[PDB]
Amino acid sequence: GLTEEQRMMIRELMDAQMKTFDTTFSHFKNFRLPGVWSQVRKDLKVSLQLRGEDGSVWNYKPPIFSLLPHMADMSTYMFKGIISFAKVISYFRDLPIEDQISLLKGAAFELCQLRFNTVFNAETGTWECGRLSYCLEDLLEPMLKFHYMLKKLQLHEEEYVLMQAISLFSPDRPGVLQHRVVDQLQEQFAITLKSYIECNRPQPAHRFLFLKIMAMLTELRSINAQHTQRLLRIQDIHPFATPLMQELFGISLTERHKILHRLLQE
Ligand SMILES: Cc1nc2cc(-c3ccccc3)nn2c(-c2cc(F)c3c(c2C)CCCO3)c1[C@H](OC(C)(C)C)C(=O)O
Numbered sequence: 001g002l003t004e005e006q007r008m009m010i011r012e013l014m015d016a017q018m019k020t021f022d023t024t025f026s027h028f029k030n031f032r033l034p035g036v037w038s039q040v041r042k043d044l045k046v047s048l049q050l051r052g053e054d055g056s057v058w059n060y061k062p063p064i065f066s067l068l069p070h071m072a073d074m075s076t077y078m079f080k081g082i083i084s085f086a087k088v089i090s091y092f093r094d095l096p097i098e099d100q101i102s103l104l105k106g107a108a109f110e111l112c113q114l115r116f117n118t119v120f121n122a123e124t125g126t127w128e129c130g131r132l133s134y135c136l137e138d139l140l141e142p143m144l145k146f147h148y149m150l151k152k153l154q155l156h157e158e159e160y161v162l163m164q165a166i167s168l169f170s171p172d173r174p175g176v177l178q179h180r181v182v183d184q185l186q187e188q189f190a191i192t193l194k195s196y197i198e199c200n201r202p203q204p205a206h207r208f209l210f211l212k213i214m215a216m217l218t219e220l221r222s223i224n225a226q227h228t229q230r231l232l233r234i235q236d237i238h239p240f241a242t243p244l245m246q247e248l249f250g251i252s253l254t255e256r257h258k259i260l261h262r263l264l265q266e
Pocket of ligand 1: 045046047048060062067070071072074075116127129134143144
């Protein structure tokens, strides 16, 4: 029941996701591990499990700043995959390089959380990242509530990838010049998601699924703002961000974002 243009739009997004989402984290290598002012303290509860290909397990039970290098490496690895995702998309590729930088700076965290939700096991409170597992030791925390609520919707791969496109093509991110072009693209991804749900879901039980997804995207944008401000405060008193994170989080747009500009021309 989708139009031919809507099916091609989904095909292109699914192609891009398959090529750029390392779901088994088998290429996440050479990362740092935890070794063997007042607001930044409040700004900072999981165990890390590293399964060896031989059976052996290394587990890290936490006691603050000792997890930051590892998190910076995982985030940077995820952000590289999200930049590669946006590059594969023709609608993104045809935008001016400055608007490409602006959209990625605005959506990097949101797209990373959407991809992390696909590996989140809500029954065990664990993000299953291939041989790495981040297990909640223990709904009040907005980011946790978001992962539990999104997982509960039991979305298809197509719905997650349309959520990524809707979040990526946000016309109101700081620095966006082609507001009307990006707004038209976002509207067509949202209409495509709405049509996909009408055509593929048994009508009554999924009657408001599209609205629930759009509400989750609104909540995600709000959490993104809280995360960015928390990160800048931590970075200000204890530097940890990698050069790519510094560019994405704001720590002549092509001159200020040379790593991003290089990654986009590759
Ligand atoms: C609040 C917060 N506390 C902590 C704490 C530890 C941590 C990591 C290793 C050992 C001990 C503690 N990790 N960790 C993370 C964290 C970070 C990541 F990169 C990441 C993952 C998570 C859990 C899971 C998938 C792999 O990637 C977060 C936040 O994660 C969410 C937004 C909630 C997802 C965040 O992004 O700050």
